[model samples]
Target: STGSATTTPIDSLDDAYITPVQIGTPAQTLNLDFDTGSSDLWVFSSETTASEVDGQTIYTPSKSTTAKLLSGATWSISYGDGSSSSGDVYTDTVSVGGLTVTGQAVESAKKVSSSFTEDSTIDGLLGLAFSTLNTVSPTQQKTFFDNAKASLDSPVFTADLGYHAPGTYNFGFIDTTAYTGSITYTAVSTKQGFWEWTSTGYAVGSGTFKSTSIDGIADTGTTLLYLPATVVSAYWAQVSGAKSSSSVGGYVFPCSATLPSFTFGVGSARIVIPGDYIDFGPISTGSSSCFGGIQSSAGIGINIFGDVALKAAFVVFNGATTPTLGFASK
Candidate 1:
């Protein structure tokens, strides 16, 4: 019988959408980030040093009858934001949405970066990326979605993230009602452990779109969109009195400036991001300076279409034989 899972949104802080995942036999539940950027199911645990543990709920392996230690195996995971988690492995029954996977490798953290400790609500990450990128040693672990895909009607997941509102992450099936019109499909490359794809072109405001290509990743765990230096510079040039500020660490412009909408090409379809969304917020309170939400991808090899860009459309991540990305208006 085929099965599916529906993930409901929780309170978040720009980092990403959080969902409840149940691990262990008696179901030791935890809030986890469904990251499509990396592959590894890791969590804050009793194994973490007391000094590193803060407001997070630790996953106690001993509390679950189904948990078994994976001797000599360990894992380390990092993010572009500088947050990281490392630990040993434990096999346990893990459940998400409504689907469950038996003998899933749950990485128990012995060390976590400051970002993880400060982001208290997120207990762990359930990577939705390819299993080849899983960090477990000796043997790479399969994500809960990967392990359960065999029993699913479709080896696909949909990310429907909303702006300051509840959104759904559906597995095994695509709910037609969640999106509008048709889904424009684009091929995805999983070679880099991400939903990497090429944007055929991009446009600023009402200007004609340029056919120059852009390589980027659709990262659910990231908060902002990061484009190449040239692309970022061109975008900011359209705004009046804008400059790359060292203090702000990105582009800043006049608070009252009327910015233009930014659009990116996906195959033949184009997704538009409203101008109003470009202004993240004022550089500081009571100041007429504003910071641009879209920044540069300097240093990082690829541009990241993080939550800001992803939330602008309904995305379908097909992890089956031919990995494809389907996007449509939300």
Candidate 2:
């Protein structure tokens, strides 16, 4: 059977997408970031140090009769954004959008970095990537999707992210009505435990499409689009006052600048990201300099097709024997 859930952006900046999840026998609901970049269904919980806890809703294993501690199992994950969380593991009943998965491994946070603690809107992270990325030691636990795949109508999930708006995440079956065009499928490499694929090429605004193979991962957990330096530079160069600043960390430009749209190829299909989408709000409160959603991936090592790119199209993560990613315009 299929299930659907609504994912909402935390703020106007669309920093992250948060979905409500039910955990435990009594069904304690908590809003979590459904991250495809990482695999570790961890949560802020009663196990967390009280001092580290802020305004986030915490999962209480003690309150769930179905909860059972996984003896000696522990987990720790550090993200590219410098945020991290570590804790012990517990298996309990977990539900998402009416899809129930019994004995789902849930990592109860013992400690969380300041970045996580400060983000009160998200209570935890629900990892959608492959189970191989799970940080739980001794016995790497399967992700919620992996555990539920067998019972699902199809071993697949779709992400329809929106710009500063709520979107839908569907599991099992693809909603045909959700997208406009025929989907273009591409092979996915799980070698790094990510939905890694090579993009055919890219075009800036109405410019000619460059035929370069750019490898990247479809990461919903990340906020911005990160590409090769050359591609990022080309797009920013089109803007009147865009500049790569060492002080602000990445590329920023005048807020009123006439930004150009970015188009990337997924196989033969092209997904166009609107100019306004790339203008990632002001760098600081009321500042005229706005941070760019598309940035250089030089330091990141691997390019990331994060929310900025994902929101431009309907993305399908097919978890078949040979995984493939599908992109369709919406």
Candidate 3:
């Protein structure tokens, strides 16, 4: 069993740690971090040093004929995961998802590392979760959601973050035909302002639930679903994982049949996590076990639903309708 950690809705999700959104005009693709902490759009500059910028999607000032940089403003952002990037402020015709707004405020980082620079899978993130939950912003910045609220055909930004598997993200609405069953849902708390959710909790099997009632926040900026120590221990008891001997972190579970189908429910929304998500790759630890579904971040706060949840179903945060999350089966 584990203790519960409660949370409040943020003012915004744009912050230092979050990756900036990339606005490709005409036919360029758009990406953003569905964050719930702070507000602000930042992009890796064309000059990011180190091998960190090797595989990332860099935004060049030269690319935008209308791009402008902040004369004296300098900034940098770091995440709880120990990843960070530093650069200056810039603005351009920022296209959020599909909505384009010119003269949008953004950061152009000169130095970056960790995931965005190392992995380079996505160009940038569209932070749509909230405006106050950022990992690095000292003061809350204007999030893309708040910035584009007025121009959006439908203000609601739905995240199909991949789910327990791969899924699709939508701007206005999600097609319910994507799933095999009726989609379950919960209402967003209007008072909180941010995208805080009422999570049902995580589990390995039916009724074999954790003795603790955990709080899971819906955040696309985070990379994995971090769980409590007791819950992680409980989960490991049922499955097989190689433990981190030193102060490395949580157990790295294997991608095997022993790993049960993990599940989570909020209102009527039930999500199943596959074994591959837990099979964390070997960084320093002997085995990669966290691939199971849940990982450990020690004091990282509440459980997070990231890309894993996005891939499994069509998630719609109906900001257009006000204070309610609309769900559909994928």
Task: Give the Cα RMSD of candidate 1.
Answer: 2.1
TM-score of each: 0.93, 0.99, 0.74
What stretches of model 1 exceed 4 Å from their correct place? 1-13, 283-288
- Is 1 or 2 the stronger prediction by TM-score? 2
- The candidate scoring highest on TM-score is 2
- The sequence of per-residue lDDT tens digits that candidate 1 reaches over residues 1-330 is 233344444443344677888899789999888888888999999999889888988899999999999999899987877778899999999887777789999999999998788877888888888888999988888887788878878888888887767677887888899888889999899888789989888998998998988988888877788999998898999998999998878889998899898999988888998887676777777889987878999987789998878888999998888898989986
Off by over 4 Å in 2: none
Candidate 3, residue 114: Cα displacement in angstroms equals 5.1
TM-score ranking, high to low: 2, 1, 3
lDDT of 3 by residue, 250-321 (tens): 555553435655666666456776655454454444644333346664677656665445445556666655
Residue-by-residue lDDT tens digits, candidate 2, 1-330: 778999999999898999999999899999999999999999999999998888999999999999999999999999998889999999999999989999999999999999998989999999999999999998999999999999899999999998889999999999999999799999999999999999999999999999999999999999999999999999999999899999999999999898899999998889999998887888889899999999999989999999999999999999999999999999
